[PDB]
Nucleic acid binder design. Structure first.
Ligand SMILES: [Mg+2]
Lengths: 55, 158, 346, 225
RNA sequence: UUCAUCUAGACAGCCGGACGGUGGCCAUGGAAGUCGGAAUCCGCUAAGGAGUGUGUAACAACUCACCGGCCGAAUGAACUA
C-alpha cells in the first residue's frame, strides 16, 4: 500500500485548491489562520536554517 | 580449506559477548567460552580498551588478532589510566598531545593511510584529532591545520 | 474499570477542545439580538449562553476526570503499571492541574454571572461576556502539557492485557537469550517472536490455557538482568515486581547449554539475586535442549554448584525440551499438580 | 523546498577548472589520454594511489574541448585539436614521464572485480532455488545462510515482479527462476538485480585507444581493446 | 516590481555516483543520519550534509541536495495590485 500512501500524500498536498473555499462561511477564516500559522512556521524554519548555515 | 573473513569490535582484556558472537560462530559450532578465552588472551595487551578482534576461521580453527582504531588510539596515546566509575560521567583523557606521539599515531596508520606522503597522513591525523577534541601541545587543535599550511609546525618525514 | 480501562471516552488537545466547545456553543446559542429589546431579554440571553458554555466545559472535563481511576489505591497487591511504563509524579501533577482548572472554571462562571446580573447596556454586557470568554481561553490554554501527557497515558493503557490478581495463575521467568516465548507458543495461542535474542518478548504477556480440567493463566517475564541488582529498565523492573508481588507458582529457567547468551557464567549470580525474592513462591526449574546438550556428561565442578542450589529444599531440575510435544506436556502437568498440592496443603 | 546546508556550486567551479587545466597543461612532458567513462570512487582511489606522481584532474567533455581548442587557430600546444574530438564520453588527463611500454602493459593487464551490466555478455546461469529467497542467490549453504525482511516486499512485487538472484525479499516461489542466462541481454529488472550483495561478476580492465606526444606535438591515436 | 539562471546547456523526467577516517563522543541491549544531548573536520573531486525523510529491533535498501549523460527556449523565487 506504499502507492496508496503516496497517492494519499499527493492528494493531501493538492487539496489546498479544493479547500480554498469551504462551508457557507466562518470556515475560510479558520483556513486562513491555519495557512498563516503554517507560513509563519515555514519562515521561522527557513530563517533558523539560514542562520545555522551562516554560523 | 575455506577461509572466513569477518570484523568484530570488543573491549580489550575482556570476554567477548556470546550473544553478539552467536551469528559469527553459529554454523561453526565452536565454544563461545573458548572464543572468549581466546579474545581475552589476544587482547590482554590492552586493559579496558575498545579494539577490533579478528576471527580467522578455516575449518573451525580459532585465530584472533588485534587491530586498533583511530579514536581508541587517540584516547590511549597519552597512556593515562583508563578507569570506569559508576559515580563519574562524561570523563575522557584530554591531556596535551606532544609531537612525539603525533609521529607514532601518524606512523601506525600511515601504512594503510590513503595519503601518499607522511604530510598527508599527518594532516589526516590532525583532522581526526580536531574531530576528537582533545588538547594538543597546549594548543587549540583548530589552528594546527593552518599552522601546518603556513609551515609554523614542521613534521619530519623519512 | 475492573482490570480493563478501555472505556476512556476520547481525548483532544487543549486548543482543539477550546475550539470545539466555542464553536458548538456559538452554533447552539441564538445569535439574533437587536437594540430594540428590554434589558431583561438581553440579560437572559447572555446569562444563558455563558452558563451553557460553562456546563459544556464541565461536562467535557468530568468524563475524563472520572475515567482515570485511583492509581494510588486500586490494586495494591499489584499496582505499579503505568508509573513503571512512563512515570507517576508528573502524571498526577497534570491530572491535578486539570482538576484544579475544572474546580476554578465554574467558580469563575458563577462570579461573572453574578457580576453581569447588574448589567445595563449592550456595550458593557458584550465587553464582559468577551472578558469571560477570554478568561476561559486563557485557563484552557494554560494546560497544554497535561493533555499531551494524557494522550500518551491513554494510548499506553489501552493496549494493556487484563490481569486478575485474586485468581489462580502461574509465572514463567528465566535468564534471557534462550527463547522464552517458546513456552508461550507451545502452551497457549498469541502473537510473539522467538528470535534468538535476549528480549524474545518485549512486555508482559498472559495466556489462557486449560489443563487438569481447569483453566489457568501464565504470565511471561520479558527478561531479567542483574548487573547492578537494583537499577534496571522497565523490561526487567516489571518482571521483578511481578515476581515479588505474586504467590503464583514460578518456573525458573537457566540455559545449561554450550550455546547461549551468557554460556555458564552468571547463573550463580542469578540464583543469589533471586533467592531473597524467591521464598514461598513454588520455585520450579527446567532446562531446554537436553537432547542436544547431553546432560549425562555434566561436569562435577558445576555439579557442585548445582548441589549447592539443591541445598535449598525448593529445587527440582529435570530434562526437557520444547522441540518435542511430550516433555513440555509432562512438565506443565507436573507444575499444575504442584500448584494443586500447594493450594490443598495451604 | 530544501532543508540542507549544501547548495549549488555555481560557476567558480568552472573557473577553477579552467585555471587548473590551463596551468597543469605545462607541468610535465608526456600528457595522457584514455577511454574510460564510467568509473567508481574506490577505483579512482586505487588509480590515484598508483599514479600519485600525476594529477587525477577531469571535468566536463565540453570544457575539456574548450581547453583543448574548439578551432585550429587557437591551441595551447601544437596539434591539440586532434585530442578534442578524440573521445565523446568522459575521460581524464595525466602528466606522467615514466615510460610508454610499462604504462601500456599496466593498462592492458590490470583487472579488477566490479559490476558492468552490459547489453552483450556471457554470464553464468544464476538460479533461485526453493520458495524461500536469499540475497546472494544461494551460493553458501542454507545452514550458514541468513533470512531477509518482507517489509520491502511491495518494492520487488511492483518494480521487479520476478524472482531475483540478488536483492531478494522474503517470498515463496513454486519453482526456481533462472534470472540470468548465458548470452542474454539484460533488461531493467535484470540491471536492478545482481547489485545488492556485492558479488562482482564483472571484470574491469583498461581499454586504451588514445595517445599524444608533446615534444612531437602531433597527431597520435592508438586502438587497443 | 525586485533578485537570479541560461549555447561557459537551466527547471521537470530516465539513468549513474552520494566514498574513508567513523558503528564520530554521553544514555547501550540497541543509536551507522534520522526514541535522544552535545554535535560543525579533512582526505579528493564536479559532488557527497558527524546527514531533510521512508523504517528495521538493529543492519540493510530506498529516497533528498550536489554533481554527470539524453533531449535545446527562454525559465525561476519572492512580493504588489
Ligand atoms: Mg523467547
Amino acid at each position: 500500500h506504499e502507492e496508496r500512501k503516496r497517492k494519499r500524500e499527493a492528494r493531501e498536498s493538492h487539496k489546498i485548491s479544493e479547500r480554498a473555499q469551504k462551508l457557507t462561511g466562518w470556515k475560510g477564516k479558520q483556513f486562513a489562520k491555519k495557512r498563516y500559522a503554517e507560513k509563519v512556521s515555514m519562515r521561522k524554519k527557513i530563517k533558523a536554517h539560514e542562520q545555522s548555515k551562516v554560523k | 580449506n575455506e577461509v572466513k573473513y569477518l570484523y568484530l569490535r570488543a573491549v580489550g582484556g575482556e570476554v567477548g559477548a556470546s550473544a553478539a558472537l552467536a551469528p559469527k560462530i553459529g554454523p561453526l559450532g565452536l565454544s563461545p567460552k573458548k572464543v572468549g578465552e581466546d579474545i581475552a588472551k589476544a587482547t590482554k595487551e590492552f586493559k579496558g580498551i575498545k579494539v577490533t578482534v579478528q576471527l580467522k576461521i578455516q575449518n573451525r580453527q580459532a585465530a584472533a588478532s588485534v587491530v586498533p582504531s583511530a579514536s581508541s588510539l587517540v584516547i590511549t596515546a597519552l597512556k593515562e589510566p583508563p578507569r570506569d566509575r559508576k559515580k563519574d560521567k562524561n570523563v575522557k583523557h584530554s591531556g596535551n598531545i606532544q609531537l612525539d606521539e603525533i609521529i607514532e599515531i601518524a606512523r601506525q596508520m600511515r601504512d594503510k593511510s590513503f595519503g601518499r606522503t607522511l604530510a598527508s597522513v599527518t594532516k589526516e591525523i590532525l583532522g581526526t584529532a580536531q574531530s576528537v577534541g582533545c588538547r594538543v601541545d597546549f594548543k587549540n587543535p583548530h589552528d594546527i591545520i593552518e599552522g601546518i599550511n603556513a609551515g609554523e609546525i614542521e613534521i619530519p618525514e623519512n | 474499570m475492573q482490570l480493563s480501562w478501555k472505556d476512556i471516552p476520547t481525548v483532544a488537545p487543549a486548543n482543539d477542545l477550546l475550539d470545539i466547545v466555542l464553536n458548538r456553543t456559538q452554533r447552539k446559542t441564538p445569535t439574533v439580538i437587536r437594540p430594540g429589546f428590554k434589558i431583561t431579554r438581553i440579560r437572559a440571553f447572555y446569562m444563558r449562553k455563558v452558563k451553557y458554555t460553562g456546563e459544556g466545559f464541565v461536562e467535557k472535563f468530568e468524563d475524563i476526570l472520572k475515567g482515570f481511576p485511583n492509581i494510588n489505591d486500586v490494586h495494591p497487591f499489584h499496582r505499579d503499571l503505568m508509573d513503571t511504563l512512563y512515570e507517576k509524579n508528573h502524571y498526577k501533577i497534570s491530572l491535578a492541574a486539570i482538576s484544579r482548572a475544572k474546580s476554578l472554571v465554574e467558580q469563575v462562571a458563577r462570579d461573572y454571572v453574578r457580576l453581569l446580573k447588574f448589567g445595563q447596556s449592550l456595550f458593557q454586557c458584550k465587553q464582559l461576556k468577551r472578558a469571560a470568554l477570554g478568561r476561559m481561553a486563557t485557563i484552557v490554554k494554560k494546560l497544554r502539557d497535561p493533555l499531551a501527557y494524557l494522550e500518551q497515558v491513554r494510548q499506553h493503557i489501552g493496549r494493556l492485557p487484563s490481569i486478575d490478581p485474586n485468581t489462580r495463575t502461574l509465572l514463567i521467568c528465566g535468564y534471557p537469550n534462550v527463547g522464552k516465548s517458546s513456552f508461550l507458543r507451545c502452551i497457549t495461542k498469541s502473537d510473539v517472536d522467538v528470535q534468538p535474542y535476549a528480549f524474545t518478548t518485549k512486555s508482559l504477556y498472559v495466556g489462557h490455557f486449560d489443563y487438569k480440567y481447569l483453566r489457568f493463566q501464565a504470565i511471561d517475564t520479558p527478561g531479567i538482568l542483574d548487573r547492578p541488582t537494583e537499577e534496571m529498565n522497565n523490561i526487567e523492573m516489571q518482571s521483578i515486581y511481578a515476581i515479588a508481588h505474586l504467590r503464583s507458582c514460578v518456573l525458573y529457567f537457566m540455559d545449561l547449554s554450550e550455546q547461549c547468551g551468557f554460556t555458564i557464567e552468571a547463573q550463580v549470580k542469578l540464583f543469589h539475586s533471586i533467592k531473597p525474592l524467591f521464598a514461598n513462591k513454588s520455585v520450579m526449574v527446567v532446562i531446554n535442549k537436553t537432547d542436544i546438550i547431553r546432560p549425562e556428561d555434566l561436569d562435577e565442578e558445576r555439579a557442585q554448584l548445582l548441589e549447592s542450589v539443591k541445598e535449598v529444599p525448593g529445587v527440582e531440575i529435570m530434562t526437557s525440551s520444547c522441540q518435542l510435544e511430550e516433555n513440555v506436556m509432562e512438565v506443565r502437568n507436573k507444575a499444575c499438580e504442584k500448584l494443586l498440592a500447594s493450594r490443598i496443603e495451604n | 523546498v530544501t532543508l540542507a546546508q549544501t547548495d549549488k556550486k555555481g560557476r567558480e567551479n568552472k573557473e577553477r577548472i579552467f585555471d587548473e587545466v590551463r596551468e597543469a597543461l605545462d607541468t610535465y612532458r608526456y600528457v595522457w589520454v584514455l577511454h574510460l567513462d564510467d568509473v567508481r570512487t574506490p577505483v579512482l582511489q586505487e588509480i590515484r594511489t598508483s599514479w600519485a606522481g600525476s594529477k587525477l584532474i577531469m571535468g566536463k567533455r565540453k570544457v575539456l574541448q574548450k581547453a583543448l581548442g574548439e578551432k585550429r587557430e587557437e591551441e595551447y600546444k601544437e596539434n591539440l585539436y586532434q585530442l578534442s574530438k578524440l573521445c565523446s564520453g568522459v575521460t581524464g588527463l595525466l602528466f606522467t614521464d615514466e615510460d610508454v611500454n610499462t604504462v601500456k602493459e599496466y593498462f592492458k593487464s590490470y583487472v579488477r572485480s566490479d559490476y558492468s551490466r552490459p547489453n552483450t555478455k556471457a554470464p553464468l546461469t544464476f538460479t533461485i532455488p526453493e520458495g524461500i529467497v536469499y540475497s546472494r542467490g544461494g551460493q553458501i549453504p542454507a545452514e550458514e545462510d541468513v533470512p531477509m525482511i518482507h517489509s520491502l516486499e511491495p518494492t520487488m512485487r511492483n518494480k521487479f515482479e520476478i524472482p531475483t538472484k540478488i536483492k531478494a525479499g522474503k517470498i515463496t516461489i513454486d519453482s526456481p527462476y533462472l534470472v540470468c542466462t548465458e548470452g542474454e541481454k539484460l533488461d531493467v529488472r535484470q540491471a536492478l538485480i545482481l547489485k545488492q550483495f556485492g558479488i562482482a561478476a564483472s571484470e574491469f580492465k583498461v581499454k586504451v585507444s588514445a595517445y599524444y606526444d608533446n615534444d612531437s606535438s602531433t597527431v597520435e591515436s592508438t586502438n587497443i581493446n
